[PDB]
Amino acid sequence: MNIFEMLRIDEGLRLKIYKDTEGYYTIGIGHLLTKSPSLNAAKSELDKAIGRNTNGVATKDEAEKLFNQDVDAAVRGILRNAKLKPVYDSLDAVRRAALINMVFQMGETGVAGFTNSLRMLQQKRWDEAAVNLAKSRWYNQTPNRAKRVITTFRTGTWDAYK
Ligand SMILES: [Cl-]
Ligand SMILES: [Cl-]
């Protein structure tokens, strides 16, 4: 298992513009297009992302390219973030993937706000962190996915994904 396969399981793959769990237009492997209520605005962002008149549809290769770009951006965001970097640096490889997953879903800002959990993770207080992570809108809105990521931070194994 690795970050790509992990996120592929969590996000799925859809080749036509769809609405995510929050009702925002997305495409491919969890690639958010826009928070705007307008389908046209979404089609326009899709075309600009892929570089062609797509008509709201992407091919598999295109979706996978957006995915590679997004994972790369998530990592790079973490490394540039003063609150995130130190946590990431302190973690083992598996847990690092858990942190990337969270950033991919909610953004640098979103995750950087889990101040208390981040400190616990940095301290390697696994069970405590897991408890704190669960007291969040994130967990209440997408509990199955959140449980998978949490278990990952708790155990440092990929058991939740197997
Ligand atoms: Cl893009
Ligand atoms: Cl879920």
Curated annotation (Swiss-Prot):
It is an enzyme of class 3 (hydrolase). Changing residue 20 to C: Nearly no effet on specific enzymatic activity. Substrate binds at residues 32, 104, 117, 132. Belongs to the glycosyl hydrolase 24 family. It is found in: Host cytoplasm. The gene is E. It catalyses: Hydrolysis of (1->4)-beta-linkages between N-acetylmuramic acid and N-acetyl-D-glucosamine residues in a peptidoglycan and between N-acetyl-D-glucosamine residues in chitodextrins. This is Endolysin. Optimum pH is 7.3. It comes from the Viruses. It comes from Enterobacteria phage T4. Coiled coil: none annotated. Endolysin with lysozyme activity that degrades host peptidoglycans and participates with the holin and spanin proteins in the sequential events which lead to the programmed host cell lysis releasing the mature viral particles. Once the holin has permeabilized the host cell membrane, the endolysin can reach the periplasm and break down the peptidoglycan layer. Its EC number is 3.2.1.17. Changing residue 132 to M/F: 2-fold decrease in enzymatic activity. The lineage of its organism: Viruses, Duplodnaviria, Heunggongvirae, Uroviricota, Caudoviricetes.
